[PDB]
Every structure is written in structure tokens, then in C-alpha cells.
Design an enzyme around this catalytic site. Structure first.
Site, mmCIF file in Angstrom:
data_model
loop_
_atom_site.group_PDB
_atom_site.id
_atom_site.type_symbol
_atom_site.label_atom_id
_atom_site.label_comp_id
_atom_site.label_asym_id
_atom_site.label_seq_id
_atom_site.Cartn_x
_atom_site.Cartn_y
_atom_site.Cartn_z
ATOM 1 N N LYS B 149 0.835 -1.194 0.000
ATOM 2 C CA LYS B 149 0.000 0.000 0.000
ATOM 3 C C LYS B 149 0.874 1.249 0.000
ATOM 4 C CE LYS B 149 -4.172 1.619 2.437
ATOM 5 N NZ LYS B 149 -4.942 1.445 3.701
ATOM 6 N N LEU B 198 -7.875 8.000 4.008
ATOM 7 C CA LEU B 198 -7.843 6.572 4.312
ATOM 8 C C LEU B 198 -9.122 6.091 4.996
ATOM 9 C CD1 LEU B 198 -4.245 5.557 5.571
ATOM 10 C CD2 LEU B 198 -5.196 5.507 3.255
ATOM 11 N N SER B 224 -9.739 0.834 2.979
ATOM 12 C CA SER B 224 -8.857 1.729 2.231
ATOM 13 C C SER B 224 -7.772 1.026 1.403
ATOM 14 C CB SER B 224 -8.210 2.752 3.170
ATOM 15 O OG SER B 224 -7.636 2.156 4.316
ATOM 16 N N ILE B 245 -7.800 -0.145 10.046
ATOM 17 C CA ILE B 245 -8.278 0.542 11.236
ATOM 18 C C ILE B 245 -9.800 0.601 11.312
ATOM 19 C CG2 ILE B 245 -8.501 2.966 10.502
ATOM 20 C CD1 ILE B 245 -6.927 3.784 12.976
ATOM 21 N N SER B 248 -10.177 -1.854 6.625
ATOM 22 C CA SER B 248 -9.455 -1.544 5.399
ATOM 23 C C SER B 248 -8.608 -2.699 4.857
ATOM 24 C CB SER B 248 -8.582 -0.306 5.613
ATOM 25 O OG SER B 248 -9.321 0.752 6.211
#
Lengths: 551, 551
Positions: B149, B198, B224, B245, B248
Site C-alpha cells: 500500500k 484513508l 482503504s 483501522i 481496510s
């Protein structure tokens, strides 16, 4: 030529530049404040000629912030106005040299437009011009420095047009036009970059790296006189001399929002320049000035031609430089060749200039249609490299890599037999004769010929690197040898210049240029220039019409 | 941060992507056939970051048609099986890199899942891995490339988590987990897209545009870690690293029909990733792998933990990655939280998995009821953006617009006083303690605790754009910090997954999600995934149970 490995030679080229850059900083005599800001500028010069650095987004904005009032008050002055101060002795020839030397140094780092500074000889020229003030006060270009493309011979220098193999080709003479300009009180102070083979509308070589646009550092400066376009776009030279065989004066001038004149062949001396294919005459290059200042363009032509250059160069015609007495004008607008349509910023420039001419009573404005523009590529496809690019490829015996843009220019080159050249020379002369008839078909009932045509210089503003894949908007007029003056109109406007909606491309090449214009933000602050085209030897009509368009 | 206008910056981001895309294509070395089919693929990349293109209807179908046997034979192979080929040298590291680079390019165009390719360093990695074959053949991930990512730091790159203002935030180090994986024979080869802030279960940003689902181009990739989910749903990467979190990691994995492990906080190093709210500790993100292979998820977890990462990151626990010794299982089924009911494809996935576990003798299967799921929204509503979203909103000083999905996440955020944080930290710890009491209430007469719970990842399969208006099916387990493994079950079946008849919604939000599921055809070919939930540090039980669920 040379046969050493090209990496060693690129070093030697870099050393020559760095040696002249060091001497220039000494001549410019930075105070600590400027030396500090200069040191912290983003550079378009890399660690080697294949490393292109990280140029500023707006090199011109950085230039105006970095340079002091002590410099900009001179270099931002219109050169014709500055000549008054040099004549009246409000400013010294050495004072002007110091300012422009400093400007070119800052411009060099921001755009990578300088191949070699000439501060030793420039200080000698400027010093004795001050000493001789009383006797040379009268000269039309007294005290004015200027830039020259690297291909232009200067005493004691190598002339390479960007090819590393020619670094040992030293000349002991200046170009005729240079000596004439010196005879009229000017002197060269910097040599600007030119690309490999000279046959690209960009400015990349293994002698200097990559030259970038003065208004947007992500875009090309243009070419082949890319250094000239960038340096004079940054207003770091009063004017410069380039060459134009495929658009190589007008494309840099248009990309950097300044003036550039492809003058008619036979007016000003250019044959002693160096290029590839020396002795090739089927298609001949011309020279001409680039400048921020239209008045400066006109004055250089007037100065050179009034020196009667046909008494040194016998290829030239004894035709005076004379302002036209026309009170009315007939002007055509060339909206498209219907092969590659212009991008929105150019399209708005055409309407702006059209509406301005229509608003003046003395202009008749008509639409100008193309005439067999495909034949331009076909004929120039055979005559640009009529030896099958053998002469150019021999420059790569050093191992010098072939740039992507150069590939386009030499792909398909035939080594013509004499009868093949004769065939295409006849094709060339027939097209020129056919095109004249096309132009004259626009004469009105009273017999008034078209005085000029307004056309794009390129299908877009300054291109993204390695995308100048269409030449016709400039090379058309090299095939025809018509005088063409690039001139400023406007800048990209993010509100007005959004991409065309529901666009249907005309062909694969038109689709390519459409997709190249992804959004105006990709070309932020890029100048949108146009050009004025005239019949052979009507250069002055173009200057006069450009004068009206800027008032 | 930066304060330039956001359109200029979106340019720089696109330029970074496009220059690396050019380099990736040269590394992949397309033949004429692949270059042709690639050029003609429908793109989810637009001309600018606000133009989302026109993605293929089924990107994976086009991906399998477009790529050659020479690539698919590698990228479609299970990576654990591929490691044997790399170990025995039936294939070189450079061969594996070239194939997956080619796959990522096709995946990038079809789904818009790549922010930046890393072919320069990846070629250096793969080459030296081949040279060092004899000394490094023994490493557990020898020769395997992987995706990271964009929020994960990599040497020499900007780390922005999708915000244009952070494009000049350059790092000189890799994330710990990246260096650990490199130490075991792997290397990263591509950076995947991540959205604005995010904090959306989708993948839209002004650095890349919009990322779409690998199975249906009209639906979201999830977020995300949207780039990771799309790229690994297309099997164009062996595995990737995301962050989680608020769902994601599991939401991308569930939307693209692959595996994704939200590991227990403190097992695998993640703190050096970049996000908004740096220094906020009230609710912490975790990392973990996404892949089409369950065996590859397990091997990555085993590989990093056996490297003793608590000797580099002191927030971690020295707890071995250990396969569980269980012979029987007690498993709960979470059919609904009774706030938003799952759509028919998810409900059928729950039935399928229940009957399969019931058909095996050694599983006891019970219904699992919610525990105050409304409290999840209340607590996370105060702790996700505990500074009143000041840190995020400061990113929009460039003029970068606020996306609709980002708006949901920051609306109502309070700038907490220290005492307010204390109050809500206590609510958080109380809820966690209460929930544990709830979980243990399912222990049987003999004292056998619940080993795992099977729950939706989302009230539906991959959502339509801008509709991910309910988080609890993932964010519940971030508040609790329970490990959760998303895993595949089934696909939408147009006969079986018709809308519920005579449905009575539970509330306005339930009504919204019911109306979103207009017909199974709107989600044709969408994977229907579920997830396994375990108590803290029971990650391995989740892997083992998923093993049985897949045969």
C-alpha cells in the site's frame, strides 16, 4: 570526426560548459545574496548528460524572484529602449554585459539552455566598445550582446550541432552574420544548446542533457533552437540567432511565448552554419532572429540587410528591408490542415486574433483552406535525409545512443539515386507552383492578393517531452520557403481551455494529439502562440501585421 | 506539507505514476500481441484524477483473455507452489518479476489499482537474488515479489496516503515489515492505491482517480487498501500488505473474493506506516497480508513473526506463530447485528458455511448474538478523529476537494479535551471488557470456549460507488482489536439471490441498504465473502478453520 567512446566525450562537453560557467560567474560578480539564491535553485542540469535533473514548475517565476533589481532593470528592458541608454551613455557596455551574463547563468540552471558561455571574448568586445564610445556611438546595435545557437561558427570553438564526434572540429572564423552584427556594434556572449541531428522539435543531446520550457519546466523548450527559445523566453538575452529547416526557429519561439522569424531564403547569410548533410541543397535551412521584442526582431533584419550581405554571400538577393506602405490588408486564417486539429489553447488564439483583425476596419479576413498537406511529409520524407541518413548515423560510431525523437526523423530515409532526387526535386517545384496558385486563388475581384495567413505553429502549446510527432504546421513552410513569423497571443487558461467534448478524431495521429491534451493543467502557464505566413520576400508585411496585433 | 494549487499537484502525482508505468512496460517487454491487446483494453484510468474512465464490465475476464500463457502460467500459480519452482530454479527470480510486472500493468489499466510501479529497484532485487541463489535459496520467501500500500514507506519515495499536500514528504527508509520480508527473500515491486483520508471503505483519491472491483467494474474495490484488493483479486501480485483501522484489509479482500488477515495488534510491525492523526493512540491500525492464497497469508505471517520483530519494534509481543493443536471446534454464526441485515448473497454465504461445518462431526455450531453494536459507532465516532479532524482538514489547504465518502468519516468529529479522551478511553476499555464477557457466555458445560465466529464483512457484496454507509461489520473488530480473516465462500447467483420479498426494514439505514440491493444483476459476478473472528492473538485458529472451509 572522432571515434572515442561517447561517455568520455560527454564529459569533455560538460567540462567545456562547466569551465565557461565558472568564468561567467566571475564576470557576473554575484553578491552573496544572489550566489545564495542561485545555489538553491532547482536545476535542469543533471550529474550526466542522460540525467535530466528536476526543473522548476515555473522557471520564469523563479528567475524573476532570484535575480536582483540591479540585473532585471536591464534585462527586462526592451532591447530597442536599452540601445538608447547605451547610446546616451546612461549605461555602460560592460554594465549591460554583466547583467545579461548573470541572467543567462540563472537561466542556464533553470532551463539548461546554455552550451557554452563566452565571457572572455564578451568582456573584450564590451570593454573596447566603451573605449570607442565616441566613434561607435552611431552603430545601430551599439553595446548590445546576443546569443547564438551552438551550430553557428565562432572563432576558436568546436561546432558540433550536438554530436559528440565533432568536438575536435575547431573553426578559426565567425559566421558571416556574426561578423556583420559585430560590425554594427553587437557581440555574442553565450552559445545555446541544440539537439542531436538537429531534426527534432525538442532540445535533447548528449552534449548538454535536456532543455526545458521557460514557462513550464515539465514541457519541452522546442527545437532545434531550443536553447534560444528558452534563453530568450527567460529574457536572458536581447535576441538570438537560430536555424529553421523544419520549424527549428518558430517552434522554440512559439513554445516560449516570444517572437521568431523564419526569414525568406536569400536575405540573410546562413550557409556557413554547420549541420548534418553538408552540401545537401534539395531543402535548405534558413536563419533568423528570436527575441522577446518584436522591435528587436525588425531591427536585426534591418541592420543585417542594410549591411548589404550579398557582397559577402553571393547566394543572397539585394532586396532592401522596407516597411510596407499598405493601408489595407487581406488576411487568411488557417484553422486546421484537417489532418491534426489544434488543441483548445491554439484554437482560442485563432479566434482572438481573428476577432481583433475584424475589429479593425482595414482588414479583410477570410478562411484559408489547406492544399495537399500530406505532400509535405511525402516530399520532405525523401529530401530531408536524401543520403538515407548515412551522414548522421556516422556520428554514432562513438556509441552515442539514438534518441527517440531522432528515430522519427531518420526512419524511412532512402539513399536516393540521382534520378530519385531529380524526381523529388520536380515534385518539390510542382507543389510550390501548385501552392502559389492556391494562394492566389484567394485574390479578390479588384486583384488584391492575400498579404498574410495566420496559422498554428504546432497542434498545441509546448509539447510534453518526446511527443512532437507532427511537423507539418512548420515544415509546410520550409517545403515552400515562405517567410513565417511566430508571435505571442495568449496563455493557457484553465477555465477556457478544457478539452473538447464529444471529440471525434480525424485519424490515428489526430487521436494521439487529442489524448496528449489531457487537461489544461498539464500545460499550465504555457504560451499559446501563432504565426504569420507571407509569400516569398514579404517578411516585412508579417512584421507590420504583428505590430498591429500587439498594440 | 505543500500549499501549491491541487491541480498542479495531481499533475505531479499522475506524472510519477506515468513515468513508472513507462519503465514497467520496458521491464515486462511485451511482444506485439500483448502490446496490441493491452492498448485496446477499456481503462479505469481517466485523463485526470476526477475522470474515472469507463472500466470493463468484468475486469478479470478481460485480464485472463489479454495475458499470454507465458505470464499466466506464473501469476495464476499458487505462490507457495511457485516458491518450490523458484527454490529448485525451474524459474528465475527475474522471470517471476517480469511476469507479475506484466500482470500488474494489465491490472493497473483495468482496475486502476497501482499508484506507482517499482521496476528499477525490483529488477535490482530480482537480479541479485538470482546471483545469490546458492546462499539465499534456503530463505522462506526466496524470489517472491509483493505489493505494498502507498502508505507504507519505501526508500526514496513520497508517502502521502493519497493526500496531494504530502507529495514532497520523501523517506529514506523502508517500513520494518518490508525490510523483514526482504531479509527472507522477498521484495516489493508495486505500490497500490489508497483513498483520501484513508477513512472510506472505497478507493477514491486525488492522487489516482477511482479504483474498481476485479470481478465487476461498476462496483468498488473496497478500501482503504483498495489497490491491494483489486491487484490481488486479479492475481497480479502474489500477496500484498495493507492496513486496517476500520475494515481496510477485510473489506478489499471480501469485495475481491480473496483472503485478508487483520492481525492482532502487537504481532506484526505497522506503526511506521503513514496516515492522518500521527501520534493518535486511542484506536490503533494494524497490518496483515492480502492474497488469493490462504497458504500464502499463513506463510507471510509465519515468516515475519519467526524473524522476532519485537527485537526491532518494541510494541510487539514475543508470541510464536503456532498452528493450533485443536481436534474439535466450537464456532458461532453471526447472522446479523440487527441494525443492518445482510443482503441475500451474504445470507446464502452464511447458510453454506453453516451447513458445511455442521456436516463435519468435530464442529459445534451455535448462533452468535450481537452485543451493543450501536456503541461501536458512538465510541469510534469520538476516537477516530479525536482532534476534530483538524489534522485531515489541514490537507485540503491546497484546495483539494472533500470527497463525499470522506465527508461521512469526518462529520461530527470533536476536538477532544484530555478529559474527554479519558472518558471515551474508559468507554472503550469497558466495552472491550463487556464484550469479552459476552463472548465467554458462549462457553459450554465442559469449559470449551468459542474458538471463532463467522460474520459478514459488509452488509452486502462489493458496494456501488459512494454507498459504504455502514462500518460496524468490520469496525466492530477494530474497536475490540480482534483478529479477523476474510475468506471466500461463493459468488452471486442470479436465481438464488433475488431481493427478499415482503421485507420490513429495521430502520432508515437498513432501508437504505435494502434498496441498494436492487437486483443480483447489479452485482453480477461479485464474490460473496465472509470472515472468521477470533479472540486476541488467536489468528492461527482462524487460518486453520479457513483451511477446512476450503477443503
Amino acid at each position: 570526426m572522432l571515434t572515442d567512446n561517447w561517455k568520455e566525450l560527454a564529459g569533455k562537453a560538460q567540462s567545456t560548459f562547466q569551465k565557461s560557467l565558472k568564468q561567467a560567474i566571475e564576470l557576473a560578480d554575484f553578491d552573496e545574496g544572489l550566489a545564495k539564491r542561485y545555489g538553491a535553485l532547482p536545476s535542469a542540469i543533471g550529474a550526466n548528460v542522460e540525467d535530466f535533473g528536476s526543473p522548476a514548475q515555473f522557471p520564469l517565476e523563479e528567475y524573476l524572484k532570484a535575480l536582483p533589481k540591479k540585473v532585471l532593470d536591464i534585462t527586462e528592458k526592451d532591447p530597442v529602449e536599452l540601445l538608447k541608454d547605451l547610446k546616451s551613455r546612461k549605461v555602460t557596455c560592460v554594465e549591460v554585459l554583466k547583467a545579461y551574463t548573470a541572467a543567462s547563468i540563472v537561466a542556464s540552471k533553470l532551463t539548461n539552455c546554455v552550451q557554452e558561455f563566452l565571457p572572455i571574448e564578451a568582456l573584450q568586445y564590451a570593454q573596447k566598445l566603451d573605449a570607442d564610445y565616441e566613434t561607435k556611438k552611431h552603430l545601430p546595435l551599439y553595446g548590445l550582446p546576443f546569443s547564438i545557437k551552438e551550430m553557428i561558427p565562432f572563432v576558436g570553438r568546436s561546432v558540433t550541432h550536438g554530436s559528440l564526434c565533432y568536438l575536435d572540429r575547431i573553426v578559426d572564423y565567425n559566421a558571416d552574420i556574426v561578423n556583420i552584427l559585430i560590425a554594427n556594434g553587437a557581440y555574442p556572449f553565450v552559445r545555446t544548446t541544440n539537439p542531436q541531428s538537429l531534426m527534432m522539435l525538442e532540445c535533447v543531446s548528449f552534449s548538454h542533457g535536456r532543455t526545458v520550457n521557460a514557462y513550464n519546466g515539465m514541457l519541452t523548450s522546442g527545437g532545434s533552437s531550443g536553447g534560444e527559445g528558452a534563453l530568450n523566453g527567460m529574457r536572458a538575452s536581447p535576441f538570438g540567432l537560430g536555424s529553421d529547416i523544419g520549424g527549428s526557429i518558430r517552434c522554440p519561439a512559439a513554445f516560449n511565448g516570444i517572437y521568431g522569424l523564419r526569414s525568406t531564403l536569400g536575405r540573410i547569410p546562413t550557409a556557413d552554419y554547420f549541420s548534418c548533410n553538408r552540401g545537401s541543397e534539395s531543402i535548405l535551412s534558413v536563419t533568423g532572429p528570436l527575441s522577446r521584442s518584436l522591435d528587436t526582431v525588425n531591427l536585426v533584419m534591418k541592420t543585417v540587410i542594410e549591411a548589404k550581405p550579398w557582397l559577402i554571400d553571393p547566394t543572397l538577393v539585394p532586396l532592401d528591408w522596407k516597411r510596407p506602405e499598405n493601408k489595407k490588408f487581406r488576411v487568411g486564417i488557417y484553422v486546421s490542415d484537417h489532418i491534426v486539429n489544434p488543441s483548445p489553447p491554439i484554437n482560442r488564439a485563432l479566434s482572438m486574433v481573428t476577432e481583433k483583425l475584424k475589429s479593425l476596419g482595414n482588414f479583410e479576413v477570410v478562411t484559408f483552406e489547406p492544399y495537399k498537406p500530406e505532400k509535405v511529409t511525402e516530399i520532405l520524407g525523401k529530401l530531408y535525409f536524401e543520403d538515407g541518413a548515412r551522414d548522421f548515423r556516422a556520428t554514432l560510431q562513438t556509441g552515442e545512443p539514438l534518441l527517440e525523437q531522432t528515430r522519427w526523423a531518420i526512419e524511412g530515409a532512402e539513399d536516393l539515386d540521382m534520378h530519385d532526387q531529380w524526381y523529388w526535386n520536380l515534385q518539390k517545384q510542382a507543389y510550390r507552383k501548385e501552392f502559389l496558385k492556391h494562394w492566389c486563388s484567394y485574390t479578390d475581384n479588384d486583384g488584391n492578393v492575400l498579404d498574410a495567413v495566420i496559422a498554428p505553429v504546432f497542434p498545441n502549446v509546448a509539447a510534453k517531452h518526446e511527443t512532437t510527432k507532427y511537423w507539418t504546421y512548420t515544415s509546410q513552410w520550409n517545403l515552400l520557403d515562405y517567410p513565417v513569423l511566430a508571435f505571442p497571443v495568449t496563455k493557457v487558461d484553465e477555465s477556457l481551455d478544457q478539452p473538447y467534448k464529444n471529440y471525434k478524431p480525424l485519424n490515428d495521429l489526430d487521436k494521439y494529439f487529442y489524448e496528449q491534451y489531457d487537461s489544461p493543467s498539464s500545460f499550465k502557464n504555457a504560451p499559446a502562440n501563432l504565426c504569420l505566413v507571407g509569400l516569398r520576400f514579404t517578411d516585412e508585411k508579417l512584421v507590420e501585421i504583428a505590430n498591429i496585433l500587439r498594440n
